[PDB]
Design a protein around this motif. Structure first.
Motif, PDB file in Angstrom:
ATOM      1  N   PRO A   1       0.785  -1.225   0.000  1.00 56.72           N
ATOM      2  CA  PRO A   1       0.000   0.000   0.000  1.00 56.72           C
ATOM      3  C   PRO A   1       0.832   1.297   0.000  1.00 56.72           C
ATOM      4  O   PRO A   1       2.075   1.240  -0.020  1.00 56.72           O
ATOM      5  N   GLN A   2       0.138   2.448   0.002  1.00 59.18           N
ATOM      6  CA  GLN A   2       0.762   3.773   0.255  1.00 59.18           C
ATOM      7  C   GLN A   2       0.224   4.351   1.562  1.00 59.18           C
ATOM      8  O   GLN A   2      -0.961   4.480   1.755  1.00 59.18           O
ATOM      9  N   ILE A   3       1.115   4.754   2.453  1.00 64.20           N
ATOM     10  CA  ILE A   3       0.760   5.159   3.826  1.00 64.20           C
ATOM     11  C   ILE A   3       1.274   6.582   4.054  1.00 64.20           C
ATOM     12  O   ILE A   3       2.469   6.866   3.867  1.00 64.20           O
ATOM     13  N   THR A   4       0.371   7.495   4.402  1.00 62.69           N
ATOM     14  CA  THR A   4       0.754   8.867   4.745  1.00 62.69           C
ATOM     15  C   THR A   4       1.077   8.951   6.232  1.00 62.69           C
ATOM     16  O   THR A   4       0.898   7.979   6.962  1.00 62.69           O
ATOM     17  N   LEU A   5       1.581  10.085   6.690  1.00 59.58           N
ATOM     18  CA  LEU A   5       2.185  10.148   8.012  1.00 59.58           C
ATOM     19  C   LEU A   5       1.513  11.122   8.975  1.00 59.58           C
ATOM     20  O   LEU A   5       2.072  11.511  10.006  1.00 59.58           O
ATOM     21  N   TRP A   6       0.226  11.393   8.717  1.00 57.90           N
ATOM     22  CA  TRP A   6      -0.525  12.284   9.605  1.00 57.90           C
ATOM     23  C   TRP A   6      -0.791  11.620  10.922  1.00 57.90           C
ATOM     24  O   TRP A   6      -0.972  12.288  11.946  1.00 57.90           O
ATOM     25  N   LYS A   7      -0.896  10.301  10.887  1.00 58.81           N
ATOM     26  CA  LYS A   7      -1.007   9.491  12.086  1.00 58.81           C
ATOM     27  C   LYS A   7       0.211   8.586  12.151  1.00 58.81           C
ATOM     28  O   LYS A   7       0.917   8.432  11.147  1.00 58.81           O
ATOM     29  N   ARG A   8       0.458   7.996  13.318  1.00 59.97           N
ATOM     30  CA  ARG A   8       1.553   6.991  13.426  1.00 59.97           C
ATOM     31  C   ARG A   8       1.298   5.830  12.452  1.00 59.97           C
ATOM     32  O   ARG A   8       0.185   5.401  12.332  1.00 59.97           O
ATOM     33  N   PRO A   9       2.328   5.339  11.708  1.00 58.07           N
ATOM     34  CA  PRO A   9       2.156   4.287  10.713  1.00 58.07           C
ATOM     35  C   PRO A   9       2.125   2.925  11.373  1.00 58.07           C
ATOM     36  O   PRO A   9       3.038   2.149  11.291  1.00 58.07           O
ATOM     37  N   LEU A  10       1.093   2.696  12.164  1.00 60.24           N
ATOM     38  CA  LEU A  10       0.849   1.445  12.868  1.00 60.24           C
ATOM     39  C   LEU A  10       0.165   0.442  11.971  1.00 60.24           C
ATOM     40  O   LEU A  10      -0.816   0.749  11.243  1.00 60.24           O
ATOM     41  N   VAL A  11       0.681  -0.774  12.017  1.00 60.21           N
ATOM     42  CA  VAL A  11       0.147  -1.876  11.272  1.00 60.21           C
ATOM     43  C   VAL A  11       0.080  -3.142  12.106  1.00 60.21           C
ATOM     44  O   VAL A  11       0.744  -3.231  13.120  1.00 60.21           O
ATOM     45  N   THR A  12      -0.718  -4.091  11.658  1.00 58.24           N
ATOM     46  CA  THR A  12      -0.809  -5.374  12.284  1.00 58.24           C
ATOM     47  C   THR A  12       0.213  -6.281  11.652  1.00 58.24           C
ATOM     48  O   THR A  12       0.360  -6.338  10.433  1.00 58.24           O
ATOM     49  N   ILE A  13       0.908  -7.008  12.512  1.00 59.99           N
ATOM     50  CA  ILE A  13       1.853  -8.021  12.077  1.00 59.99           C
ATOM     51  C   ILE A  13       1.478  -9.357  12.668  1.00 59.99           C
ATOM     52  O   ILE A  13       0.732  -9.419  13.643  1.00 59.99           O
ATOM     53  N   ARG A  14       1.938 -10.439  12.069  1.00 60.92           N
ATOM     54  CA  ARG A  14       1.777 -11.754  12.669  1.00 60.92           C
ATOM     55  C   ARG A  14       3.152 -12.307  12.873  1.00 60.92           C
ATOM     56  O   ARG A  14       3.981 -12.248  11.968  1.00 60.92           O
ATOM     57  N   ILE A  15       3.394 -12.830  14.057  1.00 60.41           N
ATOM     58  CA  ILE A  15       4.725 -13.314  14.443  1.00 60.41           C
ATOM     59  C   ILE A  15       4.527 -14.440  15.470  1.00 60.41           C
ATOM     60  O   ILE A  15       3.716 -14.291  16.409  1.00 60.41           O
ATOM     61  N   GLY A  16       5.142 -15.598  15.225  1.00 65.62           N
ATOM     62  CA  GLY A  16       4.945 -16.770  16.097  1.00 65.62           C
ATOM     63  C   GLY A  16       3.499 -17.265  16.228  1.00 65.62           C
ATOM     64  O   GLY A  16       3.136 -17.904  17.237  1.00 65.62           O
ATOM     65  N   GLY A  17       2.658 -16.959  15.245  1.00 71.16           N
ATOM     66  CA  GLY A  17       1.246 -17.352  15.275  1.00 71.16           C
ATOM     67  C   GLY A  17       0.313 -16.367  15.968  1.00 71.16           C
ATOM     68  O   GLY A  17      -0.894 -16.609  16.007  1.00 71.16           O
ATOM     69  N   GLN A  18       0.864 -15.280  16.504  1.00 73.90           N
ATOM     70  CA  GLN A  18       0.139 -14.250  17.258  1.00 73.90           C
ATOM     71  C   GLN A  18       0.139 -12.932  16.494  1.00 73.90           C
ATOM     72  O   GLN A  18       1.140 -12.614  15.833  1.00 73.90           O
ATOM     73  N   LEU A  19      -0.949 -12.165  16.631  1.00 72.26           N
ATOM     74  CA  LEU A  19      -1.096 -10.825  16.058  1.00 72.26           C
ATOM     75  C   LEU A  19      -0.596  -9.748  17.015  1.00 72.26           C
ATOM     76  O   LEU A  19      -0.834  -9.792  18.220  1.00 72.26           O
ATOM     77  N   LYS A  20       0.136  -8.787  16.474  1.00 75.31           N
ATOM     78  CA  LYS A  20       0.608  -7.656  17.243  1.00 75.31           C
ATOM     79  C   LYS A  20       0.497  -6.377  16.421  1.00 75.31           C
ATOM     80  O   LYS A  20       0.412  -6.455  15.205  1.00 75.31           O
ATOM     81  N   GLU A  21       0.510  -5.222  17.089  1.00 76.64           N
ATOM     82  CA  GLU A  21       0.550  -3.920  16.410  1.00 76.64           C
ATOM     83  C   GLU A  21       1.979  -3.411  16.437  1.00 76.64           C
ATOM     84  O   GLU A  21       2.619  -3.543  17.445  1.00 76.64           O
ATOM     85  N   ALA A  22       2.483  -2.812  15.359  1.00 74.93           N
ATOM     86  CA  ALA A  22       3.828  -2.269  15.314  1.00 74.93           C
ATOM     87  C   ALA A  22       3.919  -1.048  14.429  1.00 74.93           C
ATOM     88  O   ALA A  22       3.128  -0.887  13.514  1.00 74.93           O
ATOM     89  N   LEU A  23       4.910  -0.237  14.713  1.00 77.19           N
ATOM     90  CA  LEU A  23       5.161   1.028  14.023  1.00 77.19           C
ATOM     91  C   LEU A  23       6.160   0.772  12.899  1.00 77.19           C
ATOM     92  O   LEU A  23       7.244   0.216  13.162  1.00 77.19           O
ATOM     93  N   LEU A  24       5.832   1.176  11.680  1.00 77.79           N
ATOM     94  CA  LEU A  24       6.824   1.154  10.586  1.00 77.79           C
ATOM     95  C   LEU A  24       7.825   2.277  10.793  1.00 77.79           C
ATOM     96  O   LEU A  24       7.453   3.462  10.797  1.00 77.79           O
ATOM     97  N   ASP A  25       9.084   1.941  11.047  1.00 79.00           N
ATOM     98  CA  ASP A  25      10.012   2.897  11.538  1.00 79.00           C
ATOM     99  C   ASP A  25      11.317   2.963  10.705  1.00 79.00           C
ATOM    100  O   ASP A  25      12.293   2.180  10.900  1.00 79.00           O
TER     101      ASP A  25
END
Ligand SMILES: CCCC[C@@H](CN[C@@H](CCCC)C(=O)N[C@@H](CCC(N)=O)C(=O)N[C@@H](CCCNC(N)=[NH2+])C(N)=O)NC(=O)[C@@H](NC(=O)[C@@H](NC(C)=O)[C@@H](C)O)[C@@H](C)CC
Length: 203
Positions: A1-25
């Motif tokens: 996708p294309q992501i603008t930066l007016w808000k924090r660029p938080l996305v959902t990730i999956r890691i070890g079978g679990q969902l988490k939120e993380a910042l694209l940094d």
């Protein structure tokens, strides 16, 4: 996708079978996630940012799905303030920084995204950091009034002087806004100014 930066660029990730939120940094060399258990062996490391260092567990070759895009690489686990996806994985998913939504320069993330800025009639090098809310510039004797502020990074908080309505030219593009001055290890351009120049994440 294309992501603008007016808000924090938080996305959902999956890691070890679990969902988490993380910042694209873009300002992070590495991916750092809050305490959790990961399959496989880990080894101790230290990583730093504003205010110094924390101890983390390094896991290698971990599959991570980042907004539906697959990566397999190194994940550091420890007491980070915020889960962050750093350049080690952003490069795997083809993420770039683009000015003026892609009319301007494209910055790849193979190395730190360092550019030239102009502030207070000085030229300086600064890191384009999508994981920074604010813009933080190394101790610089700006004339004029300020208010105290504390800002927080991976190793703690530092005290800074907040100055408002400061022009900052970023790779030739004029911005004007709040600049925080204090003892950072690298000058940081944050979202407050990246938005003014049409900067986007693309992958
Ligand atoms: C964890 C908090 C969110 C992410 C973080 C990423 N900032 C970069 C800035 C660059 C250093 C000053 C960072 O810490 N990068 C680290 C992340 C850790 C990592 N391992 O990737 C890094 O690359 N560290 C390198 C060290 C830098 C030098 N490396 C090099 N030249 N190759 C490293 N490998 O240890 N953002 C911040 O630190 C900013 N914080 C914030 O934006 C928010 N604060 C909090 C607590 O969330 C807001 C509420 O203030 C600071 C600058 C204030 C506006």
């Amino acid at each position: 996708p294309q992501i603008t930066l007016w808000k924090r660029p938080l996305v959902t990730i999956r890691i070890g079978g679990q969902l988490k939120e993380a910042l694209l940094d873009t300002g992070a060399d590495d991916t750092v996630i809050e305490e959790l258990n990961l399959p496989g062996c880990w080894k101790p490391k230290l990583i730093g940012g504003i205010g110094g260092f924390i101890k983390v567990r390094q896991y290698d070759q971990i599959p991570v799905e980042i907004a539906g895009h697959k990566a397999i690489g190194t994940v550091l686990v420890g007491p980070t303030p915020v889960n962050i996806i750093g350049r080690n994985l952003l490069t795997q998913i083809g993420a770039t920084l683009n000015f003026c939504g892609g009319g301007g320069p494209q910055i790849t993330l193979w190395k730190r995204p360092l550019v030239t800025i102009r502030i207070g009639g000085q030229l300086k090098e600064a890191l384009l950091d999508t994981g920074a809310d604010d813009t933080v510039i190394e101790e610089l004797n700006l004339p004029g009034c300020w208010k105290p502020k504390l800002i927080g990074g991976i190793a703690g908080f530092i005290k800074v002087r907040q100055y408002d309505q400061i022009p900052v030219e970023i790779a030739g593009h004029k911005a004007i806004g709040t600049v925080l001055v204090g003892p950072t290890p690298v000058n940081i351009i944050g979202r407050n100014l990246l938005t003014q120049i049409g900067a986007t994440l693309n992958f």
